[PDB]
C-alpha cells in the first residue's frame, strides 16, 4: 500500500532457485516484490543518515576590507615596505605607480606601491566529508495487508521501518503474520562517498563531488583549523584598482552566494539542519524470501455480502485498486476475487495483493489487481449477491512492451552498470551484460567527464555523421552515436 500512488513504481517478478531476488532501491522510487506463493511486499528507501561528518574545507564567501594602509617609494629604490605584511590575515598586492617631485620624492619615473587591509570573513561555506562507515539507510517494509488506512499512508506507522548499516550486512525484520524477512543490501557500493563532500549553506545544503569542491576559487581554511583568520588565496575576493598610475586602492568583491547557487546547477540539494538527511542516491539489495509466510491461511471463506465503499481507481502502471467492506458473518475470512472473462471461462488477470483476509467486519479492505488490456470484470463475493465489476484497460501489449523497454532504458541510463541488478536472478546473460556495461560505462565516463547535455548531443550528432560516411565500423559508430544522443537527451544535466 506504500507504493500505490507513486509514478516511479516498478514491478519485479519471480524468485531465484535460492529464493532470493536482487533489487535496487531509490529515493522517490519503489519496487514491489511478489512470487508464485509468497506475500507481496512494498519497499521504499525513505532516509539516508550519516554520523560524525568531518569538515574537509571551510570556504569564505562574505568578506569586508577595513584598516586599509598604503605607502609609496621613489623609483629605483626597490619596493615600499610596511612593518605589517608579516601577518597573513591581511591581503596585499604590489602594483606600479608614477612618482615625481609633486609626489614627494626627488626622482622622476615609475614608482612602487603596496596596499594592505583587514580581510574579515562575515559568512562562510563549510564542506563536510563522511566515511561510508558512518552511513545509515532506512527502509520501510509494507506487506499488502490492505487495511483501509494504508494506501499511501506514509505518515502512519503501518509498514515496518528497518535500519541497515554497513556494520551488519544481514539485517533481519519480523513481520506479524507474514513470517520474518531476510534483508541484504550493499550500502558501500551505492555511492562512493569518498569522492563526494556535503556542502552546507546558511540554511541549505548540497551533495557535490569532492574534486570540484576543491577547485572552488574561494578563500579557505582547513576544516581542522579553528583560528578563523588564515584565508588562503584572498586575492580572489579583492580587487586592487590603479586607475591612472597614481594611487592603488583595494576594494572587496561582492557576495558570491547567489553566484555559488548558480554554480550548483548540476548538484543535488540536501539538508542537515537537524541531522545529515539525504534523499538522494540508490541502494542495491538482495531480497531473501526464505521465511516469508502468508497471513490468514487458516481463515475460512467469506460467505456474506460485500459492498463497495471506494470505487475502482486506475494507477499509472495499468493496475487497479478497490476498497470493499464485508457485510456478512464469519470474520475473519478470505475475500473472493477473480479476474474473469465475459463467459467466466479463462482467468485473465492476477492479484497483486494475494489472497487477502478481512481482519474486521466493519473495517474495509483494499485490493490491488492487474487486469489485462481491454474488457475486464472483477468478481467479488459469491452468490447470493455476487458483485461483478466491469473494467476497461486502455493500451495494448505492444504498447506495454514499448513503455516498459523505454523505462528499462531510462533506468539503465540513470543507474549505470548497477541497473542490471534490478531484477537479476544470477543468470549468465545478466553477468555478461553487467560486465559489458561496466567496461562501456567506464569508457563513456572517461570520454564524457564534465560535459553538458547540449554538447553531448553535438558530439553524438558528429559521431553519427562520421559513421554514416564510412561497414562494421560504420554501424558501431552510428550505434554509439545514437545511444549517446539518447543519454544526452535523457540526462537533466
Amino acid at each position: 500500500m506504500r507504493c500505490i500512488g507513486i509514478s516511479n513504481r516498478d514491478f519485479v517478478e519471480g524468485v531465484s532457485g535460492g529464493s532470493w531476488v536482487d533489487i535496487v532501491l531509490e529515493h522517490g522510487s519503489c519496487v514491489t516484490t511478489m512470487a508464485k506463493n509468497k506475500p507481496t511486499l512494498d519497499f521504499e528507501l525513505i532516509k539516508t543518515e550519516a554520523k560524525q561528518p568531518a569538515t574537509l574545507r571551510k570556504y569564505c564567501i562574505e568578506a569586508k576590507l577595513t584598516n586599509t594602509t598604503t605607502d609609496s617609494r621613489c623609483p629605483t629604490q626597490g619596493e615600499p615596505s610596511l612593518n605589517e605584511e608579516q601577518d597573513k590575515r591581511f591581503v596585499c598586492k604590489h602594483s606600479m605607480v608614477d612618482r615625481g617631485w609633486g609626489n614627494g620624492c626627488g626622482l622622476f619615473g615609475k614608482g612602487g606601491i603596496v596596499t594592505c587591509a583587514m580581510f574579515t570573513c562575515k559568512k562562510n561555506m563549510k564542506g563536510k566529508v563522511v566515511q561510508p562507515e558512518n552511513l545509515e539507510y532506512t527502509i520501510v517494509i509494507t506487506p499488502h495487508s490492505g487495511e483501509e488506512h494504508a494506501v499511501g499512508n506514509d505518515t502512519g506507522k503501518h509498514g515496518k521501518e528497518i535500519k541497515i548499516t554497513p556494520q551488519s550486512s544481514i539485517t533481519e525484520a519480523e513481520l506479524t503474520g507474514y513470517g520474518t524477512v531476510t534483508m541484504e543490501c550493499s550500502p558501500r557500493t551505492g555511492l562512493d562517498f569518498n569522492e563526494m563532500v556535503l556542502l552546507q549553506m546558511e540554511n541549505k545544503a548540497w551533495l557535490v563531488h569532492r574534486q570540484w569542491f576543491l577547485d572552488l576559487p574561494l578563500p579557505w581554511l582547513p576544516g581542522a583549523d579553528t583560528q578563523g583568520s588564515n584565508w588562503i588565496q584572498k586575492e580572489t575576493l579583492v580587487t586592487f584598482k590603479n586607475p591612472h598610475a597614481k594611487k592603488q586602492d583595494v576594494v572587496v568583491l561582492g557576495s558570491q552566494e547567489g553566484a555559488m547557487h548558480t554554480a550548483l546547477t548540476g548538484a543535488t540539494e540536501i539538508q542537515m539542519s537537524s541531522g545529515n538527511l539525504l534523499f538522494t542516491g540508490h541502494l542495491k539489495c538482495r531480497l531473501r524470501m526464505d521465511k516469508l509466510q502468508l497471513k490468514g491461511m487458516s481463515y475460512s471463506m467469506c460467505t456474506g455480502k460485500f459492498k463497495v465503499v471506494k470505487e475502482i481507481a486506475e494507477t499509472q502502471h495499468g493496475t487497479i485498486v478497490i476498497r470493499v467492506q464485508y457485510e456478512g458473518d464469519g470474520s475473519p475470512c478470505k475475500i473472493p476475487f477473480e479476474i474473469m472473462d465475459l463467459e467466466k471461462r479463462h482467468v485473465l488477470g492476477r492479484l497483486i495483493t494475494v489472497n487477502p483476509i478481512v481482519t474486521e467486519k466493519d473495517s474495509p479492505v483494499n485490493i490491488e489487481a492487474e487486469p489485462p488490456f481491454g474488457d475486464s470484470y472483477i468478481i467479488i463475493g459469491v452468490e447470493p449477491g455476487q458483485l461483478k465489476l466491469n473494467w476497461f484497460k486502455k493500451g495494448s501489449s505492444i504498447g506495454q512492451m514499448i513503455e516498459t523497454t523505454m523505462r528499462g532504458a531510462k533506468r539503465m541510463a540513470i543507474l549505470g552498470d548497477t541497473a542490471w541488478d534490478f531484477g537479476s536472478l544470477g543468470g549468465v546473460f545478466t553477468s555478461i551484460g553487467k560486465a559489458l556495461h561496466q567496461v562501456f560505462g567506464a569508457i563513456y565516463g572517461a570520454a564524457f567527464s564534465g560535459v553538458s547535455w547540449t554538447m553531448k548531443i553535438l558530439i553524438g550528432v558528429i559521431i553519427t555523421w562520421i559513421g554514416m560516411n564510412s561497414t562494421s565500423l560504420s554501424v558501431s559508430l552510428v550505434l554509439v552515436g545514437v545511444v549517446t544522443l539518447y543519454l544526452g537527451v535523457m540526462v537533466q544535466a
Partner: antibody
Amino acid sequence: EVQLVESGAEVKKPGASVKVSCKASGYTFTSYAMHWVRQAPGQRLEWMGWINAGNGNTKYSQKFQDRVTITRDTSASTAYMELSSLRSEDTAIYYCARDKVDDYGDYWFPTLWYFDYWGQGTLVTVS
Amino acid sequence: ALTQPASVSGSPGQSITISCTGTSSDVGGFNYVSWFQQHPGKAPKLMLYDVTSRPSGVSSRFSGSKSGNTASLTISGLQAEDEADYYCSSHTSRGTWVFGGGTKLTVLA
C-alpha cells in the same frame, strides 16, 4: 618491574626554584620518553611536557613555554623537571609518567598505551 | 579544554555511561582517547586506552566508545570500589595533551 620513584614533599617561597627527581628502574631508560603531569588539589590534571631520553630533546606546553625546563640523566635513569618563579597557584601534586618511543629512537607519534605507568607524586606547597 | 559532567552517580550493579567531549582536533579526529582512575590520595592509574580496546589487568566491566566529537565510558555492574576520580585525556593535533575536568563517581548505599 617498572618502578617510578619520586622525591619527598617540598615547601618553597614564591619566586624560588624547585627541581624534582623522578627515578625509573626495571627497564631500558634510554628507549622511553618521560612525561610530567601536575594537578592542583581537588582539580583537573595539567600536562607540562615530555623529554625523550633517546636524544634529550624538549617539548613543553604552550602555557609553560617560558617557565618550565626539564632535563634527563642517562646515568641515573632519571629526569629532572625544574620550575622557576613559583606562584601561589603552583601548589599542586606533580606526577611523572612514562610511555614508549618508536623503534627509531624518536617520540613523534605517541603509542596507544601512553602513560602506561605513573609515579607516586610530589607535593609542593607555595607560601 | 575537555567538557564532561562534574559528578555522575548510579546504583551499584547497574550500567552507567559517562561522556567526555572535546573538539575536532583532539577527540573527533584521533583515537588517542584514554581514561584514568584517580584514587583519593593515590597515583592515577589507567583503566582504558584506545577505547576500542582495553588494557591488561583491567576488568571487562569498563567499556569505551567514541561517537563523533564525544567519547563515552560505560561501566557495567557498578560496585563499591568504583568510587574514584576518573579523567579523560586526549593527545591533541598540535602535539600536546589535554585532560578533562575530573569526574567523581558516586555509588548509592
